[PDB]
């Protein structure tokens, strides 16, 4: 598909690249998680996601600590867990996870990668925060399973996309 957007015919098939991985998780698990977090959005939008292993993609994902050259320094364990921003000098969506967190998957004790990632991909796609507590786009993280769009989340997507 081609979808008319912003007055222009844009492409819906997109690429993303994982630049570095968190140390507490094995690569394959981080890969499946990132894909699964992107899929919660692709299910309710005209977008598709493909993983690339070189060059620049539409979505660049990285795990960094503190200062990593973007004026959004991370703050070590806790606090901010990640963020996503649009660099002016590159046509891409940048998402960085704070390497200092105890990254986990499916464990209510650690910091869930599936949730933080789904949240960041939400930004990349245009959504902003909401006050709904159990919303994927809430400003605050609380372990919540399964990963699912709340009504406020579907409305948000329906507002930005058809
Ligand atoms: N652990 C959290 O919940 C925190 C918020 C928080 C709670 N206690 C704190 C003590 C000190 C500092 C921050 C916090 N959220 C995050 O880390 C957020 C990402 C994960 C949330 C998520 C995951 C799963 C389900 C639901 C929610 C960070 P962010 O929201 O993506 C990011 C947005 C942003 C992107 C690009 C540019 C600016 C801002 N925020 C953030 O606040 O970044 C820096 C900043 C700090 C204060 C004001 C403006 C900007
Ligand atoms: C195809 C759809 C509209 C329908 C439009 C709506 C918002 C658009 C994205 C964001 O803008 C962030 C980022 C900016 C980069 O520049 C290019 C990559 C990326 C992911 C954009 C891609 C694509 O363009 C989008 C998904
Ligand atoms: C860091 C603190 C919590 C501690 C949290 C509490 C409310 C959050 C803000 C608002 O939500 C509005 C807005 C939504 C956008 O989507 C992204 C930007 C912005 C400014 C958010 C940023 C940051 O996340 C905040 C300040
Ligand atoms: Ca942190
Ligand atoms: Zn960063
Ligand atoms: Zn956020």
């Amino acid at each position: 598909m081609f979808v008319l957007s912003g007055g222009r015919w844009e492409k819906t098939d997109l690429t993303y690249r994982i630049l570095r991985f968190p140390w507490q998780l094995v690569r394959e698990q981080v890969r499946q998680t990132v894909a699964e977090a992107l899929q919660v959005w692709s299910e309710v939008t005209p977008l598709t996601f493909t993983e690339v292993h070189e060059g620049r993609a539409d979505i660049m994902i990285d795990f960094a600590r503190y200062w990593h050259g973007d004026n959004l320094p991370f703050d070590g364990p806790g606090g901010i867990l990640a963020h996503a921003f649009f660099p002016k000098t590159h046509r891409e969506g940048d998402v960085h996870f704070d390497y200092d967190e105890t990254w986990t998957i499916g464990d209510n004790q650690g910091t869930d990668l599936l949730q933080v990632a789904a949240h960041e991909f939400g930004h990349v796609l245009g959504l902003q925060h909401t006050t709904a507590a159990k919303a994927l786009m809430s400003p605050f993280y609380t372990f919540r399973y399964p990963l699912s769009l709340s009504p406020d989340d579907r409305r948000g997507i329906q507002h930005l996309y058809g």
Side-chain angles (χ1 to χ4, degrees), residues 11-17 34-52 57-61 121-122 124-125 157 161:
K11 290 84 170 193
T12 67
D13 310 319
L14 318 174
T15 63
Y16 63 103
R17 167 144 97 107
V34 155
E36 188 185 341
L38 237 23
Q39 183 192 67
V40 69
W41 299 115
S42 72
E43 294 182 316
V44 300
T45 71
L47 311 170
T48 40
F49 298 101
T50 308
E51 170 156 16
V52 301
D58 300 322
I59 295 167
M60 291 294 255
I61 299 174
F121 296 148
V124 171
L125 300 189
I157 274 297
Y161 301 72

PDB file of all heavy atoms in Angstrom, residues 11-17 34-52 57-61 121-122 124-125 157 161:
ATOM      1  N   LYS A  11       4.824   5.795   1.786  1.00  0.00           N
ATOM      2  CA  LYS A  11       4.940   4.343   1.804  1.00  0.00           C
ATOM      3  C   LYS A  11       4.602   3.831   3.203  1.00  0.00           C
ATOM      4  O   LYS A  11       4.937   4.475   4.196  1.00  0.00           O
ATOM      5  CB  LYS A  11       6.368   3.933   1.419  1.00  0.00           C
ATOM      6  CG  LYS A  11       6.730   4.189  -0.073  1.00  0.00           C
ATOM      7  CD  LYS A  11       7.190   5.621  -0.396  1.00  0.00           C
ATOM      8  CE  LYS A  11       7.764   5.711  -1.813  1.00  0.00           C
ATOM      9  NZ  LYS A  11       8.501   6.988  -2.073  1.00  0.00           N
ATOM     10  N   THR A  12       3.933   2.685   3.286  1.00  0.00           N
ATOM     11  CA  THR A  12       3.567   2.135   4.590  1.00  0.00           C
ATOM     12  C   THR A  12       4.469   1.016   5.069  1.00  0.00           C
ATOM     13  O   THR A  12       4.433   0.650   6.231  1.00  0.00           O
ATOM     14  CB  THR A  12       2.146   1.595   4.599  1.00  0.00           C
ATOM     15  OG1 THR A  12       2.068   0.450   3.736  1.00  0.00           O
ATOM     16  CG2 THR A  12       1.181   2.679   4.149  1.00  0.00           C
ATOM     17  N   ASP A  13       5.262   0.461   4.168  1.00  0.00           N
ATOM     18  CA  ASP A  13       6.167  -0.615   4.532  1.00  0.00           C
ATOM     19  C   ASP A  13       7.455   0.041   5.074  1.00  0.00           C
ATOM     20  O   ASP A  13       8.150   0.761   4.362  1.00  0.00           O
ATOM     21  CB  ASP A  13       6.429  -1.478   3.289  1.00  0.00           C
ATOM     22  CG  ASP A  13       5.128  -1.901   2.576  1.00  0.00           C
ATOM     23  OD1 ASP A  13       4.142  -2.248   3.263  1.00  0.00           O
ATOM     24  OD2 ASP A  13       5.093  -1.898   1.320  1.00  0.00           O
ATOM     25  N   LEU A  14       7.766  -0.200   6.343  1.00  0.00           N
ATOM     26  CA  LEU A  14       8.936   0.436   6.941  1.00  0.00           C
ATOM     27  C   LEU A  14      10.010  -0.525   7.498  1.00  0.00           C
ATOM     28  O   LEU A  14       9.764  -1.706   7.746  1.00  0.00           O
ATOM     29  CB  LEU A  14       8.474   1.399   8.054  1.00  0.00           C
ATOM     30  CG  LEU A  14       7.247   2.314   7.854  1.00  0.00           C
ATOM     31  CD1 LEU A  14       6.942   3.039   9.140  1.00  0.00           C
ATOM     32  CD2 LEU A  14       7.488   3.311   6.759  1.00  0.00           C
ATOM     33  N   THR A  15      11.212   0.012   7.673  1.00  0.00           N
ATOM     34  CA  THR A  15      12.335  -0.727   8.237  1.00  0.00           C
ATOM     35  C   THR A  15      12.749  -0.175   9.605  1.00  0.00           C
ATOM     36  O   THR A  15      12.503   0.991   9.945  1.00  0.00           O
ATOM     37  CB  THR A  15      13.580  -0.622   7.369  1.00  0.00           C
ATOM     38  OG1 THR A  15      13.994   0.746   7.308  1.00  0.00           O
ATOM     39  CG2 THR A  15      13.316  -1.124   6.004  1.00  0.00           C
ATOM     40  N   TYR A  16      13.384  -1.039  10.384  1.00  0.00           N
ATOM     41  CA  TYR A  16      13.907  -0.663  11.676  1.00  0.00           C
ATOM     42  C   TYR A  16      15.174  -1.495  11.884  1.00  0.00           C
ATOM     43  O   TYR A  16      15.336  -2.576  11.299  1.00  0.00           O
ATOM     44  CB  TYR A  16      12.879  -0.919  12.787  1.00  0.00           C
ATOM     45  CG  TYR A  16      12.500  -2.361  12.968  1.00  0.00           C
ATOM     46  CD1 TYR A  16      13.025  -3.113  14.035  1.00  0.00           C
ATOM     47  CD2 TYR A  16      11.603  -2.978  12.097  1.00  0.00           C
ATOM     48  CE1 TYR A  16      12.649  -4.452  14.230  1.00  0.00           C
ATOM     49  CE2 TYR A  16      11.217  -4.305  12.280  1.00  0.00           C
ATOM     50  CZ  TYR A  16      11.737  -5.046  13.348  1.00  0.00           C
ATOM     51  OH  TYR A  16      11.336  -6.354  13.540  1.00  0.00           O
ATOM     52  N   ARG A  17      16.080  -0.972  12.697  1.00  0.00           N
ATOM     53  CA  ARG A  17      17.330  -1.637  12.988  1.00  0.00           C
ATOM     54  C   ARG A  17      17.691  -1.540  14.471  1.00  0.00           C
ATOM     55  O   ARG A  17      17.606  -0.486  15.062  1.00  0.00           O
ATOM     56  CB  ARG A  17      18.452  -1.032  12.140  1.00  0.00           C
ATOM     57  CG  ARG A  17      19.836  -1.444  12.613  1.00  0.00           C
ATOM     58  CD  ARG A  17      20.806  -1.652  11.475  1.00  0.00           C
ATOM     59  NE  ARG A  17      21.652  -0.487  11.221  1.00  0.00           N
ATOM     60  CZ  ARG A  17      22.948  -0.416  11.532  1.00  0.00           C
ATOM     61  NH1 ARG A  17      23.560  -1.450  12.118  1.00  0.00           N
ATOM     62  NH2 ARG A  17      23.634   0.691  11.249  1.00  0.00           N
ATOM     63  N   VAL A  34      10.949  -6.806  20.276  1.00  0.00           N
ATOM     64  CA  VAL A  34      10.830  -5.599  19.487  1.00  0.00           C
ATOM     65  C   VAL A  34       9.811  -5.764  18.379  1.00  0.00           C
ATOM     66  O   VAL A  34       9.037  -4.860  18.106  1.00  0.00           O
ATOM     67  CB  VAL A  34      12.183  -5.210  18.888  1.00  0.00           C
ATOM     68  CG1 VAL A  34      12.000  -4.368  17.632  1.00  0.00           C
ATOM     69  CG2 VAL A  34      12.971  -4.452  19.936  1.00  0.00           C
ATOM     70  N   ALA A  35       9.798  -6.924  17.750  1.00  0.00           N
ATOM     71  CA  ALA A  35       8.869  -7.163  16.662  1.00  0.00           C
ATOM     72  C   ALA A  35       7.436  -7.231  17.146  1.00  0.00           C
ATOM     73  O   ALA A  35       6.522  -6.735  16.501  1.00  0.00           O
ATOM     74  CB  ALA A  35       9.224  -8.446  15.975  1.00  0.00           C
ATOM     75  N   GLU A  36       7.258  -7.878  18.287  1.00  0.00           N
ATOM     76  CA  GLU A  36       5.959  -8.056  18.894  1.00  0.00           C
ATOM     77  C   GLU A  36       5.391  -6.719  19.399  1.00  0.00           C
ATOM     78  O   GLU A  36       4.180  -6.521  19.429  1.00  0.00           O
ATOM     79  CB  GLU A  36       6.101  -9.079  20.023  1.00  0.00           C
ATOM     80  CG  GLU A  36       4.804  -9.527  20.658  1.00  0.00           C
ATOM     81  CD  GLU A  36       5.015 -10.457  21.864  1.00  0.00           C
ATOM     82  OE1 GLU A  36       6.125 -11.048  22.006  1.00  0.00           O
ATOM     83  OE2 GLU A  36       4.055 -10.596  22.666  1.00  0.00           O
ATOM     84  N   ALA A  37       6.261  -5.792  19.777  1.00  0.00           N
ATOM     85  CA  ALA A  37       5.800  -4.492  20.270  1.00  0.00           C
ATOM     86  C   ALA A  37       5.387  -3.597  19.087  1.00  0.00           C
ATOM     87  O   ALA A  37       4.531  -2.719  19.206  1.00  0.00           O
ATOM     88  CB  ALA A  37       6.902  -3.815  21.097  1.00  0.00           C
ATOM     89  N   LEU A  38       6.009  -3.848  17.941  1.00  0.00           N
ATOM     90  CA  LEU A  38       5.753  -3.099  16.723  1.00  0.00           C
ATOM     91  C   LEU A  38       4.466  -3.655  16.104  1.00  0.00           C
ATOM     92  O   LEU A  38       3.707  -2.931  15.456  1.00  0.00           O
ATOM     93  CB  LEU A  38       6.944  -3.288  15.772  1.00  0.00           C
ATOM     94  CG  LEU A  38       7.831  -2.207  15.140  1.00  0.00           C
ATOM     95  CD1 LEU A  38       7.846  -0.889  15.887  1.00  0.00           C
ATOM     96  CD2 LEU A  38       9.227  -2.787  15.056  1.00  0.00           C
ATOM     97  N   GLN A  39       4.223  -4.941  16.331  1.00  0.00           N
ATOM     98  CA  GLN A  39       3.057  -5.595  15.790  1.00  0.00           C
ATOM     99  C   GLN A  39       1.756  -5.150  16.441  1.00  0.00           C
ATOM    100  O   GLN A  39       0.704  -5.199  15.826  1.00  0.00           O
ATOM    101  CB  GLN A  39       3.193  -7.106  15.899  1.00  0.00           C
ATOM    102  CG  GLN A  39       2.026  -7.828  15.266  1.00  0.00           C
ATOM    103  CD  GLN A  39       1.988  -9.294  15.617  1.00  0.00           C
ATOM    104  OE1 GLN A  39       1.770  -9.674  16.780  1.00  0.00           O
ATOM    105  NE2 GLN A  39       2.202 -10.140  14.612  1.00  0.00           N
ATOM    106  N   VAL A  40       1.814  -4.717  17.689  1.00  0.00           N
ATOM    107  CA  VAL A  40       0.602  -4.247  18.336  1.00  0.00           C
ATOM    108  C   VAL A  40       0.102  -2.990  17.612  1.00  0.00           C
ATOM    109  O   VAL A  40      -1.080  -2.676  17.654  1.00  0.00           O
ATOM    110  CB  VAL A  40       0.838  -3.909  19.820  1.00  0.00           C
ATOM    111  CG1 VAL A  40       1.707  -2.694  19.951  1.00  0.00           C
ATOM    112  CG2 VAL A  40      -0.475  -3.654  20.504  1.00  0.00           C
ATOM    113  N   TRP A  41       1.005  -2.271  16.949  1.00  0.00           N
ATOM    114  CA  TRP A  41       0.611  -1.074  16.227  1.00  0.00           C
ATOM    115  C   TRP A  41       0.290  -1.401  14.800  1.00  0.00           C
ATOM    116  O   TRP A  41      -0.647  -0.857  14.241  1.00  0.00           O
ATOM    117  CB  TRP A  41       1.708  -0.008  16.267  1.00  0.00           C
ATOM    118  CG  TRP A  41       2.016   0.438  17.650  1.00  0.00           C
ATOM    119  CD1 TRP A  41       3.184   0.270  18.315  1.00  0.00           C
ATOM    120  CD2 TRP A  41       1.114   1.059  18.572  1.00  0.00           C
ATOM    121  NE1 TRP A  41       3.076   0.739  19.597  1.00  0.00           N
ATOM    122  CE2 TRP A  41       1.813   1.231  19.782  1.00  0.00           C
ATOM    123  CE3 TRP A  41      -0.216   1.484  18.494  1.00  0.00           C
ATOM    124  CZ2 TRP A  41       1.228   1.812  20.912  1.00  0.00           C
ATOM    125  CZ3 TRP A  41      -0.799   2.060  19.616  1.00  0.00           C
ATOM    126  CH2 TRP A  41      -0.075   2.220  20.810  1.00  0.00           C
ATOM    127  N   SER A  42       1.063  -2.289  14.198  1.00  0.00           N
ATOM    128  CA  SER A  42       0.808  -2.652  12.816  1.00  0.00           C
ATOM    129  C   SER A  42      -0.575  -3.328  12.671  1.00  0.00           C
ATOM    130  O   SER A  42      -1.157  -3.334  11.595  1.00  0.00           O
ATOM    131  CB  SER A  42       1.926  -3.561  12.291  1.00  0.00           C
ATOM    132  OG  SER A  42       1.845  -4.848  12.857  1.00  0.00           O
ATOM    133  N   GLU A  43      -1.109  -3.877  13.754  1.00  0.00           N
ATOM    134  CA  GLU A  43      -2.413  -4.513  13.682  1.00  0.00           C
ATOM    135  C   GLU A  43      -3.525  -3.499  13.524  1.00  0.00           C
ATOM    136  O   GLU A  43      -4.567  -3.812  12.971  1.00  0.00           O
ATOM    137  CB  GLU A  43      -2.686  -5.361  14.919  1.00  0.00           C
ATOM    138  CG  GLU A  43      -1.763  -6.545  15.049  1.00  0.00           C
ATOM    139  CD  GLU A  43      -2.065  -7.400  16.256  1.00  0.00           C
ATOM    140  OE1 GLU A  43      -2.307  -6.837  17.353  1.00  0.00           O
ATOM    141  OE2 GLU A  43      -2.043  -8.641  16.106  1.00  0.00           O
ATOM    142  N   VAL A  44      -3.322  -2.278  13.999  1.00  0.00           N
ATOM    143  CA  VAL A  44      -4.367  -1.271  13.859  1.00  0.00           C
ATOM    144  C   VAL A  44      -3.987  -0.064  12.985  1.00  0.00           C
ATOM    145  O   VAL A  44      -4.552   1.021  13.136  1.00  0.00           O
ATOM    146  CB  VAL A  44      -4.858  -0.782  15.253  1.00  0.00           C
ATOM    147  CG1 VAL A  44      -5.426  -1.960  16.032  1.00  0.00           C
ATOM    148  CG2 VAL A  44      -3.719  -0.144  16.027  1.00  0.00           C
ATOM    149  N   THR A  45      -3.037  -0.263  12.076  1.00  0.00           N
ATOM    150  CA  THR A  45      -2.601   0.794  11.165  1.00  0.00           C
ATOM    151  C   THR A  45      -2.207   0.173   9.836  1.00  0.00           C
ATOM    152  O   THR A  45      -2.025  -1.035   9.741  1.00  0.00           O
ATOM    153  CB  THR A  45      -1.371   1.568  11.671  1.00  0.00           C
ATOM    154  OG1 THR A  45      -0.209   0.736  11.592  1.00  0.00           O
ATOM    155  CG2 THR A  45      -1.570   2.020  13.082  1.00  0.00           C
ATOM    156  N   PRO A  46      -2.045   0.999   8.790  1.00  0.00           N
ATOM    157  CA  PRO A  46      -1.672   0.451   7.485  1.00  0.00           C
ATOM    158  C   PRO A  46      -0.183   0.081   7.349  1.00  0.00           C
ATOM    159  O   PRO A  46       0.245  -0.411   6.301  1.00  0.00           O
ATOM    160  CB  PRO A  46      -2.111   1.559   6.528  1.00  0.00           C
ATOM    161  CG  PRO A  46      -1.864   2.790   7.294  1.00  0.00           C
ATOM    162  CD  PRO A  46      -2.326   2.446   8.698  1.00  0.00           C
ATOM    163  N   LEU A  47       0.577   0.288   8.427  1.00  0.00           N
ATOM    164  CA  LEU A  47       2.023   0.027   8.473  1.00  0.00           C
ATOM    165  C   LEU A  47       2.528  -1.422   8.646  1.00  0.00           C
ATOM    166  O   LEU A  47       1.887  -2.259   9.287  1.00  0.00           O
ATOM    167  CB  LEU A  47       2.636   0.867   9.598  1.00  0.00           C
ATOM    168  CG  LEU A  47       2.330   2.366   9.737  1.00  0.00           C
ATOM    169  CD1 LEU A  47       2.860   2.897  11.062  1.00  0.00           C
ATOM    170  CD2 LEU A  47       2.931   3.112   8.579  1.00  0.00           C
ATOM    171  N   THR A  48       3.686  -1.701   8.047  1.00  0.00           N
ATOM    172  CA  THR A  48       4.368  -2.997   8.170  1.00  0.00           C
ATOM    173  C   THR A  48       5.811  -2.710   8.574  1.00  0.00           C
ATOM    174  O   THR A  48       6.354  -1.655   8.258  1.00  0.00           O
ATOM    175  CB  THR A  48       4.401  -3.854   6.862  1.00  0.00           C
ATOM    176  OG1 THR A  48       4.638  -3.020   5.733  1.00  0.00           O
ATOM    177  CG2 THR A  48       3.114  -4.632   6.689  1.00  0.00           C
ATOM    178  N   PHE A  49       6.425  -3.657   9.275  1.00  0.00           N
ATOM    179  CA  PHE A  49       7.791  -3.490   9.756  1.00  0.00           C
ATOM    180  C   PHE A  49       8.801  -4.580   9.345  1.00  0.00           C
ATOM    181  O   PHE A  49       8.569  -5.768   9.523  1.00  0.00           O
ATOM    182  CB  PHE A  49       7.733  -3.362  11.277  1.00  0.00           C
ATOM    183  CG  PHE A  49       6.949  -2.177  11.743  1.00  0.00           C
ATOM    184  CD1 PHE A  49       5.648  -2.323  12.197  1.00  0.00           C
ATOM    185  CD2 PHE A  49       7.495  -0.895  11.684  1.00  0.00           C
ATOM    186  CE1 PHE A  49       4.902  -1.208  12.584  1.00  0.00           C
ATOM    187  CE2 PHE A  49       6.751   0.225  12.072  1.00  0.00           C
ATOM    188  CZ  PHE A  49       5.460   0.065  12.519  1.00  0.00           C
ATOM    189  N   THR A  50       9.930  -4.172   8.799  1.00  0.00           N
ATOM    190  CA  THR A  50      10.946  -5.138   8.397  1.00  0.00           C
ATOM    191  C   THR A  50      12.287  -4.863   9.090  1.00  0.00           C
ATOM    192  O   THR A  50      12.721  -3.717   9.160  1.00  0.00           O
ATOM    193  CB  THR A  50      11.153  -5.100   6.879  1.00  0.00           C
ATOM    194  OG1 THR A  50       9.881  -5.231   6.236  1.00  0.00           O
ATOM    195  CG2 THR A  50      12.069  -6.235   6.438  1.00  0.00           C
ATOM    196  N   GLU A  51      12.931  -5.903   9.609  1.00  0.00           N
ATOM    197  CA  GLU A  51      14.205  -5.722  10.276  1.00  0.00           C
ATOM    198  C   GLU A  51      15.362  -5.746   9.285  1.00  0.00           C
ATOM    199  O   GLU A  51      15.435  -6.610   8.419  1.00  0.00           O
ATOM    200  CB  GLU A  51      14.415  -6.788  11.355  1.00  0.00           C
ATOM    201  CG  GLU A  51      15.838  -6.805  11.915  1.00  0.00           C
ATOM    202  CD  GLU A  51      15.943  -7.388  13.325  1.00  0.00           C
ATOM    203  OE1 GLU A  51      14.998  -8.065  13.781  1.00  0.00           O
ATOM    204  OE2 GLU A  51      16.989  -7.175  13.980  1.00  0.00           O
ATOM    205  N   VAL A  52      16.255  -4.771   9.419  1.00  0.00           N
ATOM    206  CA  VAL A  52      17.424  -4.657   8.559  1.00  0.00           C
ATOM    207  C   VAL A  52      18.616  -4.702   9.500  1.00  0.00           C
ATOM    208  O   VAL A  52      18.491  -4.366  10.674  1.00  0.00           O
ATOM    209  CB  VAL A  52      17.420  -3.319   7.733  1.00  0.00           C
ATOM    210  CG1 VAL A  52      16.182  -3.249   6.884  1.00  0.00           C
ATOM    211  CG2 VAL A  52      17.454  -2.120   8.643  1.00  0.00           C
ATOM    212  N   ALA A  57      17.693   2.990   8.764  1.00  0.00           N
ATOM    213  CA  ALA A  57      16.329   2.546   8.554  1.00  0.00           C
ATOM    214  C   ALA A  57      15.311   3.641   8.987  1.00  0.00           C
ATOM    215  O   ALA A  57      15.688   4.724   9.465  1.00  0.00           O
ATOM    216  CB  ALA A  57      16.108   1.276   9.331  1.00  0.00           C
ATOM    217  N   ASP A  58      14.024   3.369   8.812  1.00  0.00           N
ATOM    218  CA  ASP A  58      13.022   4.335   9.198  1.00  0.00           C
ATOM    219  C   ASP A  58      13.000   4.494  10.727  1.00  0.00           C
ATOM    220  O   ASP A  58      12.715   5.579  11.261  1.00  0.00           O
ATOM    221  CB  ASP A  58      11.667   3.878   8.664  1.00  0.00           C
ATOM    222  CG  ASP A  58      11.662   3.756   7.156  1.00  0.00           C
ATOM    223  OD1 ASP A  58      12.297   4.622   6.506  1.00  0.00           O
ATOM    224  OD2 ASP A  58      11.032   2.806   6.624  1.00  0.00           O
ATOM    225  N   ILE A  59      13.303   3.409  11.431  1.00  0.00           N
ATOM    226  CA  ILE A  59      13.337   3.448  12.878  1.00  0.00           C
ATOM    227  C   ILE A  59      14.675   2.895  13.360  1.00  0.00           C
ATOM    228  O   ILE A  59      15.029   1.759  13.088  1.00  0.00           O
ATOM    229  CB  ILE A  59      12.159   2.642  13.484  1.00  0.00           C
ATOM    230  CG1 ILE A  59      10.831   3.312  13.103  1.00  0.00           C
ATOM    231  CG2 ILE A  59      12.293   2.580  15.017  1.00  0.00           C
ATOM    232  CD1 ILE A  59       9.625   2.488  13.352  1.00  0.00           C
ATOM    233  N   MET A  60      15.445   3.728  14.046  1.00  0.00           N
ATOM    234  CA  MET A  60      16.736   3.299  14.568  1.00  0.00           C
ATOM    235  C   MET A  60      16.595   3.096  16.080  1.00  0.00           C
ATOM    236  O   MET A  60      16.232   4.011  16.827  1.00  0.00           O
ATOM    237  CB  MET A  60      17.820   4.346  14.239  1.00  0.00           C
ATOM    238  CG  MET A  60      18.162   4.451  12.750  1.00  0.00           C
ATOM    239  SD  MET A  60      18.958   2.997  12.031  1.00  0.00           S
ATOM    240  CE  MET A  60      20.635   3.574  11.877  1.00  0.00           C
ATOM    241  N   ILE A  61      16.876   1.881  16.522  1.00  0.00           N
ATOM    242  CA  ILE A  61      16.769   1.517  17.930  1.00  0.00           C
ATOM    243  C   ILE A  61      18.136   1.319  18.591  1.00  0.00           C
ATOM    244  O   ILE A  61      18.989   0.616  18.064  1.00  0.00           O
ATOM    245  CB  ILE A  61      15.980   0.198  18.064  1.00  0.00           C
ATOM    246  CG1 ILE A  61      14.571   0.379  17.496  1.00  0.00           C
ATOM    247  CG2 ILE A  61      15.978  -0.284  19.516  1.00  0.00           C
ATOM    248  CD1 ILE A  61      13.788  -0.893  17.468  1.00  0.00           C
ATOM    249  N   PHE A 121       7.416   2.895  20.514  1.00  0.00           N
ATOM    250  CA  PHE A 121       6.965   2.802  19.136  1.00  0.00           C
ATOM    251  C   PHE A 121       5.680   3.632  18.986  1.00  0.00           C
ATOM    252  O   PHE A 121       5.385   4.148  17.910  1.00  0.00           O
ATOM    253  CB  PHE A 121       6.781   1.339  18.739  1.00  0.00           C
ATOM    254  CG  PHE A 121       8.075   0.555  18.752  1.00  0.00           C
ATOM    255  CD1 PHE A 121       8.098  -0.798  19.063  1.00  0.00           C
ATOM    256  CD2 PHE A 121       9.287   1.190  18.476  1.00  0.00           C
ATOM    257  CE1 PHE A 121       9.301  -1.495  19.098  1.00  0.00           C
ATOM    258  CE2 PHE A 121      10.492   0.497  18.515  1.00  0.00           C
ATOM    259  CZ  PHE A 121      10.500  -0.838  18.824  1.00  0.00           C
ATOM    260  N   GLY A 122       4.944   3.789  20.090  1.00  0.00           N
ATOM    261  CA  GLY A 122       3.738   4.594  20.080  1.00  0.00           C
ATOM    262  C   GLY A 122       4.108   6.038  19.761  1.00  0.00           C
ATOM    263  O   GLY A 122       3.426   6.701  18.982  1.00  0.00           O
ATOM    264  N   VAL A 124       6.929   7.116  18.243  1.00  0.00           N
ATOM    265  CA  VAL A 124       7.420   7.160  16.894  1.00  0.00           C
ATOM    266  C   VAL A 124       6.294   7.283  15.912  1.00  0.00           C
ATOM    267  O   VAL A 124       6.430   7.973  14.911  1.00  0.00           O
ATOM    268  CB  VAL A 124       8.260   5.922  16.546  1.00  0.00           C
ATOM    269  CG1 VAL A 124       8.559   5.905  15.047  1.00  0.00           C
ATOM    270  CG2 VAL A 124       9.552   5.958  17.324  1.00  0.00           C
ATOM    271  N   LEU A 125       5.176   6.628  16.202  1.00  0.00           N
ATOM    272  CA  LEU A 125       4.043   6.688  15.302  1.00  0.00           C
ATOM    273  C   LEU A 125       3.152   7.927  15.485  1.00  0.00           C
ATOM    274  O   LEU A 125       2.132   8.070  14.808  1.00  0.00           O
ATOM    275  CB  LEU A 125       3.236   5.397  15.413  1.00  0.00           C
ATOM    276  CG  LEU A 125       4.114   4.205  15.042  1.00  0.00           C
ATOM    277  CD1 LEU A 125       3.300   2.984  14.940  1.00  0.00           C
ATOM    278  CD2 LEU A 125       4.806   4.461  13.726  1.00  0.00           C
ATOM    279  N   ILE A 157      -5.075   6.127  18.045  1.00  0.00           N
ATOM    280  CA  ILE A 157      -4.615   5.736  16.723  1.00  0.00           C
ATOM    281  C   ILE A 157      -5.619   6.163  15.659  1.00  0.00           C
ATOM    282  O   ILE A 157      -5.241   6.672  14.619  1.00  0.00           O
ATOM    283  CB  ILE A 157      -4.361   4.194  16.650  1.00  0.00           C
ATOM    284  CG1 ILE A 157      -2.942   3.903  17.130  1.00  0.00           C
ATOM    285  CG2 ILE A 157      -4.559   3.655  15.199  1.00  0.00           C
ATOM    286  CD1 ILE A 157      -1.883   4.540  16.243  1.00  0.00           C
ATOM    287  N   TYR A 161      -4.583   8.272  12.589  1.00  0.00           N
ATOM    288  CA  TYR A 161      -4.715   7.549  11.329  1.00  0.00           C
ATOM    289  C   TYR A 161      -6.221   7.432  11.073  1.00  0.00           C
ATOM    290  O   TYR A 161      -7.031   7.776  11.936  1.00  0.00           O
ATOM    291  CB  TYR A 161      -4.078   6.157  11.442  1.00  0.00           C
ATOM    292  CG  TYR A 161      -2.602   6.179  11.796  1.00  0.00           C
ATOM    293  CD1 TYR A 161      -2.179   6.522  13.077  1.00  0.00           C
ATOM    294  CD2 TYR A 161      -1.624   5.929  10.827  1.00  0.00           C
ATOM    295  CE1 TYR A 161      -0.819   6.630  13.389  1.00  0.00           C
ATOM    296  CE2 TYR A 161      -0.252   6.028  11.128  1.00  0.00           C
ATOM    297  CZ  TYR A 161       0.147   6.391  12.408  1.00  0.00           C
ATOM    298  OH  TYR A 161       1.492   6.568  12.686  1.00  0.00           O
TER     299      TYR A 161
END
